[PDB]
Amino acid sequence: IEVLAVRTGPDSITEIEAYLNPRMGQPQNEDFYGFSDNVTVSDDFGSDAPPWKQFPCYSTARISLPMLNQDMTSDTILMWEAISCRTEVMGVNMLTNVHSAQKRVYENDREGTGIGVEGMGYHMFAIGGEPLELQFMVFNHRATYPAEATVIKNPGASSQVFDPNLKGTLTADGVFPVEAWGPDPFKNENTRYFGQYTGGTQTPPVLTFTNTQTTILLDENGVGPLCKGDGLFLSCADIVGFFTQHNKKMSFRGLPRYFRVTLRKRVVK
Amino acid sequence: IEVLAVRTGPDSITEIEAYLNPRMGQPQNEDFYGFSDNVTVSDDFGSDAPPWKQFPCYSTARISLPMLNTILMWEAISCRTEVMGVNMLTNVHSAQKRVYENDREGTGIGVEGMGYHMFAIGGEPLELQFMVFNHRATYPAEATVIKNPGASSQVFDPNLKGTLTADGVFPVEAWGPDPFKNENTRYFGQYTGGTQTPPVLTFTNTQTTILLDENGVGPLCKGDGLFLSCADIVGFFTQHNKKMSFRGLPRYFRVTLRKRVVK
Amino acid sequence: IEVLAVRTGPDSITEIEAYLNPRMGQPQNEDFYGFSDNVTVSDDFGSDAPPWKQFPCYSTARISLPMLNDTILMWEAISCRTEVMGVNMLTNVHSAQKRVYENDREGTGIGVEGMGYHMFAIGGEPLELQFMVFNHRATYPAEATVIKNPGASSQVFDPNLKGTLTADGVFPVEAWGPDPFKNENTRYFGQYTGGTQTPPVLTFTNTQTTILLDENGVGPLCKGDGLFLSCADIVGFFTQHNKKMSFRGLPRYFRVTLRKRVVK
Amino acid sequence: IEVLAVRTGPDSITEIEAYLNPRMGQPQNEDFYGFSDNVTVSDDFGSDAPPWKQFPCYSTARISLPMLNTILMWEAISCRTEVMGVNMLTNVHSAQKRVYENDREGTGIGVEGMGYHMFAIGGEPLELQFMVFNHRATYPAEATVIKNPGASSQVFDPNLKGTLTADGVFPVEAWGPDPFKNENTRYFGQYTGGTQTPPVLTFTNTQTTILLDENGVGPLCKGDGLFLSCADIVGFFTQHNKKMSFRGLPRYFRVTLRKRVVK
Amino acid sequence: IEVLAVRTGPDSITEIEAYLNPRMGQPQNEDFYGFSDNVTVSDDFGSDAPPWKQFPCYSTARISLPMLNQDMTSDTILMWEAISCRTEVMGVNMLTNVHSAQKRVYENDREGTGIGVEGMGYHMFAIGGEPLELQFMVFNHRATYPAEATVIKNPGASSQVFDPNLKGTLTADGVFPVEAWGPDPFKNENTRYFGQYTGGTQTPPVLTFTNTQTTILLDENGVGPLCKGDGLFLSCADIVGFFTQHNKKMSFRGLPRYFRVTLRKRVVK
């Protein structure tokens, strides 16, 4: 796309608000919505098969944007340009719950609070004018992913590091395993992505929330994501950490993410 | 509201100071004020019923500003906020499980574990999203919750809304600020989890937060009311017998307001 | 004070330096100076009497400034440098410390660990205090300055429970903190890091300046030509071989720059 | 080089992207690619021989830039660099020691312990200082080291120099960037130690590092070659039987260069 | 010193590079160079004698500076003024070693990596125009330091906090105990010092290195350290943590520090 002037005038700025609910593995609108199922662990890389529901997948949506009021006789067209966003992890408040079927601090004395949600935090969101471009990369290439999940079958040993042949695009919600796909830095010219990972299984989650924080989406040339087909593409994963039962079974807990995106009209050839 | 120019003049600027005491669960002005009761844990999400006093609720107050009456409204432009009583956490003598419990020796372990620190300043009640760890939790009569909220309440459900209209009855673990509303409120929150996490608190009288949005407009005080909200969970208090309670701290608010003309 | 203009001139700016030694509980010029005594723990809030020497108290000093005079002159504190001193001593892991591998009588001492409480205040009058305690039923010793029978509301904010920091080494840290409702003529700064096995984190440099001017460009104004310095610097806990634990504190350095201010 | 004006014109600016795969010890395109072999520990410094495959080495590449030829040289002005595959660390199912290994229950403990993250961009190979924890370590024949380095190699010895001239054979534990040289390279590194430390990793396509020195001169690419180097140790992978291995991640580089006139 | 104008001109700016090796206690150019000897612990403050080699001392050097080419007939004097520095802890790379004679993560199973270096980090450097001025302060005043060490003997109970009588100057390398001396904030008008302490015995060391970071040494008056007798005084201590043997004996491990200092000519009266 050849990028020209910002289009100013009334109705040249618009704002969308959207949510993505987490896809930690357990089915929608059933009792464990927001959790994975209890995590089983293989004995060997050669006999490793994570059952469906026991691992998180990326959340993704395309938002239909307002009509642009195109200049019919112009050589150029208008595109919605994402210039900034606010994003918040919602429901951070629920993590003050230390009474709901949790392994207790002093379990052998049957006493104390629940241990609450602890362990790894993976927080990533992406905002783009097209689907997020992905690099396939896995901890163990011999893992057999279930048929429900979108992966590269038989990826080979090279997939445990960078292999330029192992590409994909985030085209579906709740099926691309977080542990098998990451943003592709060789692409995503038309998307901004941000991730943080904090590991461990006893690590305290650290989360902030405010309605006062803006992130600029303009690149070094002052150009934000340009919305192809008048679609805004939102992607995230928000693993907060693990829920531990009394019997020590552990499951991923996730939280939904809020997006507010400010878009302006851009002239393109 | 269509917002016009800041109305300058004598007594155009005012300033309020307020405190909000914590609502950690134990009754006001009795021996465990500032604490929850000892936390009990359910064996299943199906049979989860947190008794009244065992969980914290949000604090809220409405501050009467000077009557004013295009109309004039009070606009919140800046604020200072402090957690008060951080000094008390230097107490490691008061009935605390000891570092070397089996040698009956050492200091108390003091207050540790999760920190949840949030405040809000607005010209109307804080707009809330209902969201729970376990939708099947049965909250007590004293608590304001959405009864039988359903499985979608464990993540974001756009039907599950409320507003912070009463002090010390909205469970922290059941309500958070709604980012889809609150256009006339600024809110700020941090959570640090765990049960043995070291608390970290700063205090100074030197730090100001600006409450103006991108357009230079602060919260506009509907009915000449300034709405203040917070929760300040510092961590857990552990008894010798390993019973654990929430401990909270009061919050100081200084808010500077100016006269603003609105349509 | 109605504050008028900065009085500029040859003798218009002065600098003071002072130290406050910590008040962790053990008596001055004796073998445990800088420490508390070994901490004892009550069984319940109803029978809770922290003995003298077993808890730290605030340090405070009034520095006499050069005597100055419709209007009068007052020293205005415009900036300060403050440092925790003797951070170097915490590299000591040989001095009668519980060992890392106590069961094997092997490894270093565990050193100082646990809670950090670092606070200082610079003002033109005594620091204004809010009384607030973990447990209102605690019986404080005769040596300590507290509000006796403070009531259940002293566990949170009670607007009646006020004091001013008017004596060194007797206001328990665990019973008093800065009053944000007052202190218009004082600047205070504090950080608490809790826990009993937390690593202490301390920095020191001679290159950091804190500006003491308020939003209106006025610093603390020294009433009666007095500059009021306050701090508490709890570094953490010293653990003996027999698992007895004491507070360890460090002294704090102040450099304060003051200018002459005309007031009505 | 004496440095003169920046050359300007249609093709005065070029951008390269490159990846360096990690060199953690296990052979490429085999089943443990990205890991070290299981780490064995010596009994004393005098009998200390870390087997090949059990320790990480530095990754390195020379990128061929467009040929140019007062001479013209490519000047590296800025870069973006990202650790790739951070996503893979959400795997807590693959042959890992479990959180409650005695109960055969809970997630894997995942990757934890030491982080070593460093990268360098230069117009010649990275200049290295040899420095080892134990000078008596006997490195294997596959490794490039200073043999019999002396007790002084446990600290700084100005005799113990090298250059990173080969990928996957300079051990991280024996070579670091030489601050007495690398006038024509920019390096950056972070070490977080321990064996149960939680890894902390961030990734974004939005961060630029400026490579210009105080004089406004970037790395000047000798022989029209751009030299990339890194090491990205994320932590340790722990088996059920408690055998531990280094896990590494590949690094992405984007470097912007401009034509620069020199003597 | 009456400080006057900066002297500009062709040779008015110079850069020096230097290293200070650590003085952790074990002898130079022997097998444990860079370590302390294994730390013994007293039972009581009254019977406390840290043996020579079991505790780190401060590193210090006077760097001889290039000739100034003085104005022979001028009433004024040129002095080198230290305006900025880069400083780097070197050898951070070596701490990736978890194989050399280290207590293992799973010592009972004789399995896992070494625990590596962990515990306290003490990192201070000072750049001055004269020797660093010290304040004597000890954890325990009744400690008897070895004859090899420079201390104030029988310093009294006041030496456990601030005593204005208990001063010294860092006049020798490898003999001033870190645990007995720190920078005197009441002096050092002609030196800049910087210190960080992170305590504990199992704390993870955190160290960064770059050739891109510069520290300005100018005071509030735009004046850097002025190098008296044309000497630049460099000091540091860089305790990284402890090394733990299989038999649980523990030693300090230190690292060398790199200094690059930029100096300009300053006219003084």
Ligand SMILES: CC(=O)N[C@H]1[C@@H](O[C@H]2[C@@H](O)[C@@H](CO)O[C@@H](O[C@H]3[C@@H](O)[C@@H](CO)O[C@H](O[C@@H]4[C@H](O)[C@@H](O)[C@H](O)O[C@@H]4CO)[C@@H]3O)[C@@H]2NC(C)=O)O[C@H](CO)[C@H](O)[C@@H]1O
């Ligand atoms: C992640 C995974 O699937 N692991 C399962 C695997 O473990 C083996 C692997 O981690 C390989 C990777 O190289 O290492 C094996 O351990 C061996 C090697 O490190 C070896 C040196 O290369 O050293 C030890 O073996 C020596 C000797 O060298 C061998 O030739 C000999 O057969 O055995 C010797 C034993 O002292 C070391 O043990 C891993 N093996 C074990 C055991 O951990 O497969 C095992 C089943 O064997 C488990 O299923 C793991 O989950």
Ligand SMILES: CC(=O)N[C@H]1[C@@H](O[C@H]2[C@@H](O)[C@@H](CO)O[C@@H](O[C@H]3[C@@H](O)[C@@H](CO)O[C@H](O[C@@H]4[C@H](O)[C@@H](O)[C@H](O)O[C@@H]4CO)[C@@H]3O)[C@@H]2NC(C)=O)O[C@H](CO)[C@H](O)[C@@H]1O
């Ligand atoms: C949070 C809560 O209230 N938990 C209580 C509940 O625990 C069960 C839930 O955590 C569900 C969530 O899906 O999982 C149960 O564990 C099961 C499942 O993960 C299952 C796969 O979906 O895999 C295991 O069960 C298999 C098999 O599928 C079962 O049909 C069979 O009966 O047992 C197999 C065991 O190998 C896994 O156990 C949780 N159940 C238990 C048990 O943890 O219910 C229990 C009592 O049942 C407790 O009250 C929990 O607190």
Ligand SMILES: CC(=O)N[C@H]1[C@@H](O[C@H]2[C@@H](O)[C@@H](CO)O[C@@H](O[C@H]3[C@@H](O)[C@@H](CO)O[C@H](O[C@@H]4[C@H](O)[C@@H](O)[C@H](O)O[C@@H]4CO)[C@@H]3O)[C@@H]2NC(C)=O)O[C@H](CO)[C@H](O)[C@@H]1O
């Ligand atoms: C800080 C302090 O001084 N603690 C001492 C105190 O502990 C008691 C207090 O913490 C109060 C605060 O509300 O709670 C008591 O625990 C009770 C309550 O939480 C109660 C619900 O309010 O639930 C339990 O008690 C029930 C029942 O109500 C009792 O009547 C019955 O005898 O026990 C039931 C057990 O299921 C809960 O235990 C604290 N009590 C104990 C015990 O910890 O007083 C105790 C001695 O009683 C110690 O001196 C503490 O140090």
Ligand SMILES: CC(=O)N[C@H]1[C@@H](O[C@H]2[C@@H](O)[C@@H](CO)O[C@@H](O[C@H]3[C@@H](O)[C@@H](CO)O[C@H](O[C@@H]4[C@H](O)[C@@H](O)[C@H](O)O[C@@H]4CO)[C@@H]3O)[C@@H]2NC(C)=O)O[C@H](CO)[C@H](O)[C@@H]1O
């Ligand atoms: C890193 C390594 O290779 N360690 C192996 C080595 O450990 C010895 C080294 O750590 C040296 C370093 O100085 O110290 C030995 O421990 C000694 C010394 O600290 C010594 C004072 O210099 O004090 C103790 O020894 C005294 C006495 O001096 C000895 O002559 C007498 O035999 O023992 C006395 C008992 O207190 C102290 O133990 C380290 N020795 C031991 C043992 O840990 O050598 C050992 C086996 O000898 C292992 O191979 C280590 O891995």
Ligand SMILES: CC(=O)N[C@H]1[C@@H](O[C@H]2[C@@H](O)[C@@H](CO)O[C@@H](O[C@H]3[C@@H](O)[C@@H](CO)O[C@H](O[C@@H]4[C@H](O)[C@@H](O)[C@H](O)O[C@@H]4CO)[C@@H]3O)[C@@H]2NC(C)=O)O[C@H](CO)[C@H](O)[C@@H]1O
């Ligand atoms: C750092 C050091 O050298 N410690 C060694 C020392 O420990 C003693 C000191 O820590 C002093 C400091 O004031 O306290 C002793 O513990 C006592 C005191 O805290 C006392 C109140 O002041 O309370 C306890 O003692 C009570 C009673 O008050 C005493 O009068 C009576 O003799 O003992 C009572 C026992 O309950 C508390 O124990 C420290 N003593 C001990 C023991 O820790 O000396 C000891 C040997 O005495 C060791 O050498 C320490 O390393």
Ligand SMILES: CC(=O)N[C@@H]1[C@@H](O)[C@H](O[C@@H]2O[C@H](CO[C@]3(C(=O)O)C[C@H](O)[C@@H](NC(C)=O)[C@H]([C@H](O)[C@H](O)CO)O3)[C@H](O)[C@H](O)[C@H]2O)[C@@H](CO)O[C@H]1O
């Ligand atoms: C991947 C595979 O084929 N593994 C084989 C084992 O399944 C098998 O042992 C049987 O395991 C049964 C339970 O199987 C799963 C499960 O659903 O729990 C299958 C999952 O794929 C597996 N998880 C992963 C991440 O690979 C999971 C896990 O290994 C364990 O639950 C431990 O947490 O096992 C059932 O319990 C049978 O009783 C048991 O025989 C063995 C048979 O030798 O072969 C394995 O290769």
Ligand SMILES: CC(=O)N[C@@H]1[C@@H](O)[C@H](O[C@@H]2O[C@H](CO[C@]3(C(=O)O)C[C@H](O)[C@@H](NC(C)=O)[C@H]([C@H](O)[C@H](O)CO)O3)[C@H](O)[C@H](O)[C@H]2O)[C@@H](CO)O[C@H]1O
């Ligand atoms: C300082 C003093 O006077 N200590 C006396 C002890 O030395 C003495 O017990 C004897 O100790 C012998 C070993 O002495 C050292 C050592 O290991 O070299 C001497 C060190 O000065 C001391 N360290 C410190 C920091 O004070 C060190 C330490 O206490 C222990 O090693 C434990 O780590 O001891 C040897 O073991 C003899 O067998 C032993 O008798 C006792 C005698 O009762 O009095 C102490 O006052």
Ligand SMILES: CC(=O)N[C@H]1[C@H]([C@H](O)[C@H](O)CO)O[C@@](O)(C(=O)O)C[C@@H]1O
């Ligand atoms: C969250 C929850 O469901 N708590 C319930 C507890 C716990 O199940 C157990 O005490 C475990 O501590 O049991 C009660 O009898 C009680 O203590 O009075 C009723 C309470 O409703």
